[PDB]
């Protein structure tokens, strides 16, 4: 093919997000889904303290 370079010009652009930008989003979002999954839980334990007064 005369245009053989065409699929080749992201040999490393596909590798850029695989090596340099894989934790730049996957290890960005995991703490955020960690953040919601306990600030509901810790406030739920505040319900276990609010039910103890009455």
């Amino acid at each position: 093919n005369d245009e053989s370079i065409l699929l080749l010009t992201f040999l490393g652009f596909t590798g850029l997000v695989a090596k340099y930008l894989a934790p730049a989003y996957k290890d960005f979002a995991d703490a955020r889904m960690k953040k919601v999954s306990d600030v509901l839980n810790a406030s739920r334990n505040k319900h276990v303290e609010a039910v103890k007064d009455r």
Binding site: V36, L40, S43, R44, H47
Partner: protein, 42 residues
């Protein structure tokens, strides 16, 4: 030329995709927000 041919379903694609957002796919996460409110204030 043939400017007409893609435009027939060009912006016709818009008025069916808005309704998938404005009625179906956009507000499905707003329930996902307010469920995080009725677990916030309990």
């Amino acid at each position: 030329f043939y400017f007409m041919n893609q435009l027939t379903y060009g912006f016709l694609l818009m008025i069916t995709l808005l309704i998938l957002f404005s009625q179906f796919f956009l507000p499905m996460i707003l329930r996902l927000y307010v469920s995080r409110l009725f677990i916030s204030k309990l």
